[PDB]
From a paper:
Outer surface protein C (OspC) plays a pivotal role in mediating tick-to-host transmission and infectivity of the Lyme disease spirochete, Borreliella burgdorferi. OspC is a helical-rich homodimer that interacts with tick salivary proteins, as well as components of the mammalian immune system. OspC consists of four long α-helices, two shorter α-helices (4 and 5), and two short antiparallel β-strands located between α1 and α2 (23, 24). The biologically functional molecule is a dimer (with monomers referred to here as OspC-OspC′) that assumes a knob-shaped structure anchored via an N-terminal lipidated moiety in the spirochete’s outer membrane.
To elucidate the structural basis for B5 IgG’s specificity for OspCA, we solved the crystal structures of recombinant OspCB and OspCK at 1.5-Å and 1.9-Å resolution, respectively, in the P21 space group. A deletion at residue 74 and an insertion of residue 165 in OspCB relative to OspCA and OspCK accounts for the greater structural deviation of OspCB to OspCA and OspCK, as exhibited by an RMSD of 0.9 Å for all atoms when the OspCB monomer was superposed onto OspCA or OspCK monomers. Superpositioning the B5-OspCA complex onto OspCB and OspCK revealed additional structural attributes that likely account for B5’s inability to recognize OspCB and OspCK. In OspCB and OspCK, Glu-175 is superposed with OspCA Gly-174. The bulkier and negatively charged Glu-175 side would be expected to clash (sterically and electrostatically) with Trp-100, thereby impeding B5 interaction. Furthermore, in the case of OspCB, an “insertion” of Ala-162 within loop 5-6 relative to OspCA alters the configuration of the loop, resulting in a theoretical clash of B5 with Tyr-47. OspCB is also unable to H-bond with B5 Tyr-47, due to an Ala rather than a Thr at position 162, as is the case in OspCA. Another structural feature in OspCB disfavoring B5 binding includes deletion of one residue immediately before Lys-74 in OspCB. This deletion substantially altered residue positions 73 to 75 within α-helix 1 of OspCB relative to the same residues in OspCA and OspCK. As a result, the superposed side chain of Lys-74 in OspCB clashes with B5 Tyr-102.
Numbering used by the authors:
A (entry chain A): 40 to 116, 118 to 164, 167 to 200
B (entry chain B): 41 to 114, 118 to 165, 168 to 202
The structure:
């Protein structure tokens, strides 16, 4: 086993995987935001109902979406190139769908129903959530491939 | 001894990944803070729609409790994980304790920024957010050092 070269493959694969994990976590944060649709912080630490004031919550989801795109615009690794480009495209289609639906998602008093169509995966139509789901799938594929590359480099140490 | 070093690399990678996930959740709160008082515009910019921040803050709060849960699930890092976990609880509790300004209809931009906008020159949570950020940076640095040092062992003679 050429330990110098295996060392470099491990380092590079870890660096890709770290960047992918950061993007996956940012996607997870949008799922958390979706739990706050139509909600407020109560004194008892629960979320209480306060329907139909979701505009700045959705602006937060949008800002996170553009950060995801910026990370994917810079990230690279052989057989990851296509998966990264695909994820970057999906991330742009998500942001574009939100912007295109500004007349429902970017007004005073954005309704719970419209916010759910943008970012709540459990929503049953699409104002962004289908693009969010495709983005999640694209990142899962990228993660699986990045993890397999790291696992293969570590295995060469036998 | 490559079997022992491989284990150290895979375990250190796994810890580092878990730490980076938490740091990225904290990053998302910093991005939420950019949306205080804002709405999505047709041209892709954020436009002003002031003083409707309660559900945005409920989102930050939800993320903050997830941070604590992930830290609860995490060698050589015990003290730094415990510090980060405590800081994360203190941030969530500060938000909840400020419900009278952060959990009402029409939360103002000013009060939202005192909760989650770092370096806000105008405390309703930001100081706790900043302490949490520093505690996760210290944990991240330690986890990175443990991975880097394990990898460096591979080529030692
Ligand atoms: Cl559309
Ligand atoms: Cl974990
Ligand atoms: Cl008030």
């Amino acid at each position: 086993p050429n330990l110098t070269e295996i060392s470099k493959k491990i380092t590079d694969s870890n660096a890709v995987l770290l960047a992918v994990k950061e993007v996956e976590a940012l996607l997870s944060s949008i799922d958390e935001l979706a739990k706050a649709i139509g909600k407020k912080i109560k004194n008892d630490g629960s979320l209480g109902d306060e329907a139909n004031h979701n505009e700045s919550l959705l602006a937060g989801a949008y800002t996170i979406s553009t950060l995801i795109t910026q990370k994917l615009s810079k990230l690279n690794g052989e057989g990851l190139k296509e998966k990264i480009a695909a994820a970057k495209k999906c991330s742009e289609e998500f942001s574009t769908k939100l912007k295109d639906n500004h007349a429902q998602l970017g007004i005073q008093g954005v309704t719970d129903e419209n916010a759910k169509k943008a970012i709540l995966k459990a929503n049953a139509k699409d104002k962004g959530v289908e693009e969010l789901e495709k983005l999640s799938g694209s990142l899962e594929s990228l993660s699986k491939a990045a993890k397999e590359m790291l696992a293969n480099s570590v295995k060469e140490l036998t």
